[PDB]
Amino acid sequence: TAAGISLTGGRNRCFSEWQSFMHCTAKTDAKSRAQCLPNFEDYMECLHHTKEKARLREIESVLKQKKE
Amino acid sequence: TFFHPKSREDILNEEAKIVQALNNQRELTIKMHELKREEKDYAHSYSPLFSDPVPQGGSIGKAPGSSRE
């Protein structure tokens, strides 16, 4: 009901990924719902930033041990 | 002479009608178990009027570039 609303009254930080995923769910059935896996992965990545954190861990480790 | 039993043919026919009714109820039970646990529409399961699952969020600072398909 209050889904997709910001603190300022507008779209939230991860609206677009959610909206893409919901477009793909509306296209699909429960048997074709696995097509919407990359969209849900994108939504969760926008939310929690796990993959970007692992990427930056790799970058930092190359800055860390390959130099000292 | 007092023995007036229903004939074999009519007995068989009545029993057959009973078994036909029973098999009909069987097939109805199977059909109903199959029509349940079958995927229904978004209009039948959630919302018959606002049938668009796609969310349109806030409106106070709507940025062009926020919608996505």
From TrEMBL, chain A:
Membrane topology label = Peripheral membrane protein
The subcellular localization recorded is: Mitochondrion inner membrane; Mitochondrion intermembrane space
Q: Which GO terms describe its biological process?
A: mitochondrial respiratory chain complex I assembly
Transmembrane segment boundaries = none
According to the lineage, what is the superkingdom?
A: Eukaryota
GO CC, sorted alphabetically, is:
mitochondrial inner membrane; mitochondrial intermembrane space
Signal sequence, renumbered to the chain: none
Main localization of the protein? Answer: mitochondrion
Q: List the disulfide bonds.
A: 14-46, 24-36
State the UniProt keywords alphabetically: Disulfide bond, Electron transport, Membrane, Mitochondrion, Mitochondrion inner membrane, Respiratory chain, Transport
The family classification in the record reads:
Belongs to the complex I NDUFS5 subunit family.
Q: What does this protein do?
A: Accessory subunit of the mitochondrial membrane respiratory chain NADH dehydrogenase (Complex I), that is believed not to be involved in catalysis. Complex I functions in the transfer of electrons from NADH to the respiratory chain. The immediate electron acceptor for the enzyme is believed to be ubiquinone.
Q: How does it assemble?
A: Mammalian complex I is composed of 45 different subunits. This is a component of the iron-sulfur (IP) fragment of the enzyme.
Protein name (record): NADH dehydrogenase [ubiquinone] iron-sulfur protein 5
What is the organism field in this record? Yarrowia lipolytica
Identify the segment of the full-length protein shown. Answer: 2 to 69 of 89
UniProtKB/TrEMBL annotation, chain B:
Q: For the region Disordered, what residue ranges are annotated?
A: 46-69
**Name listed for the protein in its UniProt record:** Uncharacterized protein
